[model samples]
Target: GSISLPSDFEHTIHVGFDAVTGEFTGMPEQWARLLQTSNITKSEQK
Candidate 1:
């Protein structure tokens, strides 16, 4: 029901997404941190 990251990693995080809707469904804070850290300016779907 929840997503998890590697225990040894400190600065990076990962999130799980809903395939049909192309929406993130877990770990909002971690996802936000990732976006901020990576300086994500834009996102596109393939």
Candidate 2:
């Protein structure tokens, strides 16, 4: 499925999630943390 994030967030132009890793792709860890905080991943069980 296609996904999109707020334009204000830098480097999110092509941000995407991976069911395999349970995190975001096409961006840096800093931006990934932003999404992780929002619980965008499948589950929070770290």
Candidate 3:
């Protein structure tokens, strides 16, 4: 699971994918449009 970003980027997170929803969480809509992704969650930085 990964958090969304402001365009293929985030707080050192991941790129989540939910087939059921076909949504890209925490990801930029524009980028999601071009890529196949789902809900994304942000990561904790040390």
Collision count for each candidate, in order: 0, 0, 13
Candidate 1: the clashing residue pairs are none
| Per-residue lDDT of candidate 3, residues 1-46 (tens digit) | 5986566744643455645466545555445545733224322233
In order of lDDT, best first, we have: 2, 3, 1
Candidate 2 — what's its lDDT? 0.53
TM-scores vs. true structure, each candidate: 0.23, 0.29, 0.24
Residue pairs in collision within model 2:
none
Better of 1 and 2 by TM-score: 2
Encode model 1's per-residue lDDT on 1-46: one tens digit a residue: 5998767846443455646355554444546456442212223233
Candidate 1 residue 15 Cα shift, in angstroms, is 1.7
- Number of backbone clashes in candidate 2: 0
Ranking by TM-score: 2, 3, 1
- Winner on lDDT (1 vs 3): 3
Q: Lowest summed-lDDT stretch of 10 residues in model 2?
A: 36-45
Candidate 3: residue 44 Cα off by (Å): 22
RMSD of 3: 13.6
Name the best candidate (by TM-score): 2
